[PDB]
Amino acid sequence: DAIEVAGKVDDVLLTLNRLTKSSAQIIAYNSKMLATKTGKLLHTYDESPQSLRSVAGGRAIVAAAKEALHIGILKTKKLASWEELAYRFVSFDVPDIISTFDIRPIIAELQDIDVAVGGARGAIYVYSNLLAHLHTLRVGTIQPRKYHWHRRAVHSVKWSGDGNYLISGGYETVLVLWQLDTGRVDFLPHLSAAIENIVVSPKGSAYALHLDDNSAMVLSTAEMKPSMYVSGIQSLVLGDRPSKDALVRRVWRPIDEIASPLVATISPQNPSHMFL
Amino acid sequence: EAVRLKGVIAEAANYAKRARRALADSAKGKAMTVHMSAELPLGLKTDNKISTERVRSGGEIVARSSRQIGHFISKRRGIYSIHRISEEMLLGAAGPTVVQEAR
Amino acid sequence: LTALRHRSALREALQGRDELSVINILRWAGKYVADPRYRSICVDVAFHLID
Amino acid sequence: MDIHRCRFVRYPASAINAVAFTHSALPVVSSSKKYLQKNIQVRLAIGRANGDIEIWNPLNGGWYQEVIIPGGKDRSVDGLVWVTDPDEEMADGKIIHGKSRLFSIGYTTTITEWDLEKARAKKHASGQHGEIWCFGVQPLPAAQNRKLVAGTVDGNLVLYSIEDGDLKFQKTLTRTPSKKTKFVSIAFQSHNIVIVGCSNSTICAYDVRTGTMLRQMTLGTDLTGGSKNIIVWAVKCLPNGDIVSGDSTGQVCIWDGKTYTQAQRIQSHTQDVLCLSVSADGSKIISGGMDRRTAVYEPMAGQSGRWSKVFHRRYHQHDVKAMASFEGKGMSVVVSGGSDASPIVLPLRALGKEFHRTLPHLPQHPTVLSAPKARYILSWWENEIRIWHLLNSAQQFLPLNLRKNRKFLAQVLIKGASHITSASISEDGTLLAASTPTDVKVFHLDPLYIKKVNMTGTGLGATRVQISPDKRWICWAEEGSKVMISRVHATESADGISYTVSVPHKLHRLRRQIPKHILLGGLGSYDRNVSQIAFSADSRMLSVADLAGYIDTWVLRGPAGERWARNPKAAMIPKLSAAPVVLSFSPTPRDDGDYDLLVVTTLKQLLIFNPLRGMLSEWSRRNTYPKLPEPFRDTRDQVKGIVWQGQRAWFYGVASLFMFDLSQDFSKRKRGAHESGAGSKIEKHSLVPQRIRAASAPDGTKWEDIEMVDGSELQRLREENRAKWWHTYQFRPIMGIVPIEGIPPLEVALIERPLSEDDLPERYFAEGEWER
Amino acid sequence: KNPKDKRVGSTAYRVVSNGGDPRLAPKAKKQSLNLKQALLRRDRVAKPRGGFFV
RNA sequence: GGGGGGAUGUCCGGGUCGCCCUGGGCACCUCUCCCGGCAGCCUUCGCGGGCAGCCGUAGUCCCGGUUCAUACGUCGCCGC
């Protein structure tokens, strides 16, 4: 994150690191704090943490526990002194198991955030107005909008720029686009493989897909052809992150395994090419 | 003619074995559709135990709920049936005595 | 039928039929069980139909 | 006990077509105004497509079906609109609530006003126009002058008036220029502006006063299939002026009403939307459509007036045809009737936080009876009465003989056009009585051979019928409230036995003390119609029980010098707290020559009366409602009926089955939970988050829980006056438990009725909406 | 039902008929019912009705 | 599924003849651990390990007896 310490904005690193197995904590670091290897503790939470992202500035941060979500708003504005970097944290259970999530800021002040948690049951929950629902003991009822198209776990969900479109991608090899103003969907159905990761350019024009078969493509929107393509070696990989859809006890639980040797030849009359 | 009767005796054996399981279960009182008479039922079929696991969407598995098990049992039940309850049942120990119309 | 056996759904194609429809599928299986070019698919749909 | 499970009684389900509550919304009052809102009678009308108009009572989550008014052959019901007058004030500051009336259309050129007290139609009204398809009441701004507006097939908006209980065709506002314009929906924006939905892809906004045409909103073609006209199947109006409209593309269009334009189109359903419902304040939209699919819509945060689909789900089993909402007395519900005959209620303000509930589609009256001596079971629907004989016991069968054991014995056919409202049988099955809303006829039965024993003096029909166990008294409840009784003399002869019924000798009912503001306001004398009539085992004592909780009995004094007279303790017998859902006398007589009157009412409240002593039995003194078993206190199901043994009484609701030992005394759902009018709270899978925890103290050890919101000495005396209960749910669609013979042993017929896709009507699909 | 009308050739003699709906309910119009049913199922075709039956 | 028991009903030699039992036949309930699956909490980067475990069968307050399917770009005619 880029936050103002006194009058010079700079990098702060927010790391999510474990202390037990099913728990972890968040530590913030300046460059000087990392050089002395002491960090500011922020929040320690106790349900199998997955991820941690932060809204622009450093006003709101969000932690992805497995069945819950932790919101954090910084307590004081303007960040007078460095030592007073404290986030009041609120937690609540999302009905599904968190696969991925993308937040978007309703704005240089941060008026609100709107989060989309893609849950591994195949659902895409949209929580509309989290900070305005959690600023106020008692809270008013919140109710996430449910968008269900995928069957397996969605691998990536992202809001697109101006926030009209909720784009998503899963294992059914299809980049879906939830219209989110009407009730419609419209989608690019036939890629090569499972949609592993997506991003949006700073301008709203370019999408970028990381495809599961060792690939990436930069698409221009409403052209929907790959303006840029990069592909790698596409062999069998023992992935460190195991799977996003191996969490909910499917019929065949996908395993990080190698069964057979790769069938691969180096071709004569063009030895720099390899068929596999 | 040996391979002929090999096929025949294999299918009748496998049906008698499924019948052993199904007769033990109907004796216990799980109330499935059992044949009674000395001739074969046409489709060599029995009603197996309803599994404790269901298939959700898209591919996950969850444990069956007793509610749905009862729904399927009421489905499997036939048109006419005599279902005698006993004093051991009203005490809570034993089970009922069931005879359904052989469909 | 070969594509519907390659995808695991031949049981799904057969399991909801009606009387005249299943007479029709029996009739086709009977007519074309003779040719050795597709006796395999024909006996597969025959097995599933008897079951 | 011995049970015969019976699924061969094909009770014909009827597709539910309309629902309507009495009040749309009651004003919010706190705890110190519960006296300001106790006496209001909210009733829910449901019209099924066999002309079946039923009144239910919500009962703060009880959902008890009070009254069934059936219509004749070839009669359906499309719309149901209650009209409720404003709260008028008395001279002394007492309050008189509105007098609510019921109107209905039947795919006719007629509007029929139903008399809820008389349990029949009151008036018919017919103007020269097309057959009416949709109608609605002008809402309040004036006070004494409110009018029905009805859109029909030919297009002409007819306009009827209702003043001082009169229903006449006032005039025709307009008619659309095209003759093929058909009006399929109608809802009012304000006091003078009507919004009609028209089958030429049109939503017209007319003005009532000058009868003009304010504007004509329109929709494009449907691009999903052919049939280039879209059809606006329903409209409704938000409080802030905007108009919601369900159409045939499966869309929902939000139109702003200051300019009458579209401001949002939301695609939800796959097939066409059929009905809508609005929250009372205007925050939630419920949309039910032909994909058996109900969706829930909420406003988006940020911009104003912009809606989006929160979540959708298949609640029903066939297409969701109608729904109506309600929000009052701490209960926010919406009830949706579909084509599977089963109304589902859903909590509104806590939607997604509490489960829904499918009310029983089988009727509340057991509608199955039996003569246990002749082993005859009997049921009835639209115009036929079906009688089965059983021919054997079951100890003999303790596989191939059961098909021959059950036997379709008789089918009695009724002439005329009316429908069978009630029926009853003797103990030996020789005397059958059947009452339509126009007549009552007797059938003598001979082992078949049936003969029509003629009644005389009737001609007004009756709502309830019982026969004496000694076959001497036919008692019926005519016009709902008027109980009449009649002696039948049985004359022997060389051919056999013959039966001749005398003139009906009416017996009068007690004049209860009821205030005039209560008698006038609300529904009037609606609960006066008696729900259950019951003899004693020796026919020396009759009793009736109304919808209010008054139980009035009668004792027979003999010299045929027999005559029925009022019991002197009938004034002592008190009014129950709610409607007495089952009421019968004990077959095993007492020791003092008195009787035991077992009465259970819809609050699961059990008691046993000593009627000649006019006080509660000592068992009933001992066992107060907090001493009943918990699986009987939380059934959430009205007990449909009872069957008798010596000391064991068995109860059955629709899904449950209980037995209680009356001899002995006695020693999950949460009681303190304040829920809506539908079911309990979710525990496992709900969209709302359950445990919201606040985190101070960054080390993560100090958490906070954030809640999510918007007679001692009497028992001493009773014990100074000084188990066996068994429950089950394993008979799910119970429609009739009826004892038979041939703590004593006893056989019974458990007649169930589970629905199936061969029992529902047929679905329909185009090339694009094939289900999975 | 109602008696048909006798015609002597120039005039028509007919018995007025109102004994059908005394106080129960009016009769539903079958043509309007089928019309609304057709607008419901404009071009769709039903799925196969039941299980295994001729 | 196995090993074993505690207790349910039964005939054949039976026994002073009764509580039952031994020899044979046995079907059920209960306990016991090993078999196959699931979950949680700690240690390890993981590989693995440790801990108290549940499920292997039946019918519910209501009720997951749910939620879920793969687009555009242009149509038509004739020939090889």
Automatic annotation (TrEMBL), chain A:
Residue ranges of the WD repeats are 147-188
Domain of life assignment: Eukaryota
Q: Where in the cell is it found?
A: Nucleus, Nucleolus
Q: Which residues form the signal peptide?
A: none
Which chain positions lie within coiled-coil regions?
A: none
- This one is known as Uncharacterized protein
Query: What is the covered span of the full protein?
Result: 193 to 480 of 960
UniProtKB/TrEMBL annotation, chain C:
Q: Where in the cell is it found?
A: Nucleus, Nucleolus
Q: What is this protein called?
A: U3 small nucleolar RNA-associated protein 15 C-terminal domain-containing protein
Q: Which organism is it from?
A: Chaetomium thermophilum (strain DSM 1495 / CBS 144.50 / IMI 039719)
**Entire protein: shown range:** 457 to 507 of 557
Automatic annotation (TrEMBL), chain D:
Tell me a GO cellular component: t-UTP complex
Q: Which stretches are tagged as biased composition: Basic and acidic residues?
A: 713-722
Q: Which UniProt keywords apply?
A: WD repeat
Q: Give GO BP annotations, semicolon-separated.
A: maturation of SSU-rRNA from tricistronic rRNA transcript (SSU-rRNA, 5.8S rRNA, LSU-rRNA)
Repeat region (WD), residues: 266-298
Pfam families found in the cross-reference section: WD40 (PF00400)
Recorded hits in InterPro entries, A to Z, give: PQQ_b-propeller_rpt, Quinoprotein_ADH-like_sf, UTP4, WD40/YVTN_repeat-like_dom_sf, WD40_rpt
The GO molecular function terms of this record are: RNA binding
What name appears for this protein in its UniProt entry? Uncharacterized protein
UniProtKB/TrEMBL annotation, chain E:
Top-level taxonomic group: Eukaryota
Q: What is this protein called?
A: Uncharacterized protein
